[PDB]
Amino acid sequence: GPLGSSEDQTAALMAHLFEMGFCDRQLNLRLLKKHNYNILQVVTELLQLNNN
Domain range holding 17? Predict the structure, then answer.
């Protein structure tokens, strides 16, 4: 197996959220680890959570 993943990857996922208009590097960080590097679930979370 590989030695280690690419940290740059996360940097790309963050841009996916910022494209929506969240602007919360802190949330995307706590969310990623929550979904285990799952931008899909991360973005969906910030959206629903901020549905109000």
Answer: 1-52
3-state DSSP call for residue 50? coil
How far are the Cα atoms of 23, 30, 33, 52 from residue 37, in angstroms, in the given order? Answer: 18, 10, 6, 25
Supply the CATH number for residue 26's domain. 1.10.8.10
**How many angstroms separate the CA atoms of 14 and 1, rounded?**
26
How many angstroms separate the Cα of 34 from the Cα of each of 16, 30, 31, 37? 17, 6, 5, 8
What is the experimental method?
NMR
Burial class of 30 by CB neighbour count within 10 A (0 to 12, 13 to 18, 19+): exposed
Q: How far apart are CA 34 and CA 45, in angstroms?
A: 10
